[PDB]
Design a protein around this ligand. Sequence first.
Ligand SMILES: Nc1nc2c(ncn2[C@@H]2O[C@H](COP(=O)(O)OP(=O)(O)O)[C@@H](O)[C@H]2O)c(=O)[nH]1
Ligand code: BEF
Ligand SMILES: [K+]
Ligand SMILES: [Mg+2]
Length: 404
Amino acid sequence: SISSQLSQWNYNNNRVLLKRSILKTQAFMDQLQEENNIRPIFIAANDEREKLHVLQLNGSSGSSKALSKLFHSQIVSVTNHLNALKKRVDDVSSKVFITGDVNTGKSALCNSLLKQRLLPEDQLPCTNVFSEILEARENDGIEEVHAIPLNIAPTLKEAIDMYSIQNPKTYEIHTLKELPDLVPQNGKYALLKIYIKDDKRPASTSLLRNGTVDISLIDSPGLNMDSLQTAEVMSRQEEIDLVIFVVNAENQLTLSAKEFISLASREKKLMFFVVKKFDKIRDKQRCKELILKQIRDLSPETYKRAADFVHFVSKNGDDDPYSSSDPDPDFDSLEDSLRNFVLKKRSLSKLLPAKTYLSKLLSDIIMISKSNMKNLLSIKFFQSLYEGTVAQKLMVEEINLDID
Ligand SMILES: Nc1nc2c(ncn2[C@@H]2O[C@H](COP(=O)(O)OP(=O)(O)O)[C@@H](O)[C@H]2O)c(=O)[nH]1
Ligand code: BEF
Ligand SMILES: [K+]
Ligand SMILES: [Mg+2]
């Protein structure tokens, strides 16, 4: 159809423009890394309103060689993030990350979205290993679990990245119902690839076989369990396009939740907030007000669109209650907003994280440049960098993603 073809043509245009800005911005990062290597860069002391958005420098030239090394590792971190964004902008699929504190109902929500009791769901801490659900066409139609062993690479990210269906040395095969035995084994597995078919449902009601976009769901291990587990959730975030953040109604957004949201918000201006266990709350209106106020503070653009992105969903499994015909307008409304965001609003759902991150990073570089401008060799460098990064930020702000 016309409006579908129009979204595709707009999506391709925006993807071209963002890729171009990513490459230019990486060059500025490379230029800043070389300059700092020969003449360490002055870092100003920032109050809270003027704190940098992406370049996390705990230290300043007034109060803090060791500052130079923190800067270098900051640029490396940003470079890795820009590469991850560039991979995502070029990837046709949409990866959805379902995360939150332990025991908020993450796996129950994934079962809800898949309309079956597939992922282990339990009163006590359960999911210790990233569980990615994909349609089985990627695995030649075969429904099974590929369990990626930690011991195939030095780091979990590297184990994940060397997995190939074509190379059996990178995974163990297991049946779908071995999953309750697999998801606790974070001392053994980096990640579970869970391949399923959904052949009895039409594309209109099938999330994984929707017929226009390849989607995978990643069920996260919980926040606030272990330092290593939290660090892995923090870094998996930048390799995924969309976050669904799951909130326990009794606790609202805890400090561990806010630390994740605040880190993800460097690129994810928009994200879903799904509040579970609201059915248990006695003072429902006071609870709802608390949650909404925290979202306003942590994710103001999500708050403006709260009707599309904030949902209260009590569906859980503790005959299959996830494919039951019983009416559930709360879940139905979440499923509809998710499909609309992912399938129809691709420029926003896929590409807004790239624009948001570039905008904030260019801002930071603009601030550093202004701070480092009147050796005189260094003066000319920061004048060129100021003028170039200013122009690039204006170009990124030109890119209009709200065209669907
Ligand atoms: N009453 C109620 N129980 C829920 C809800 N969501 C999840 N549960 C239950 O809470 C427990 C934890 O769910 P689980 O999905 O394992 O949470 P996860 O650890 O965050 O993945 C399970 O017993 C679920 O059945 C909800 O909205 N209401
Ligand atoms: F019990 Be975990 F938060 F899936
Ligand atoms: K649990
Ligand atoms: Mg779980």
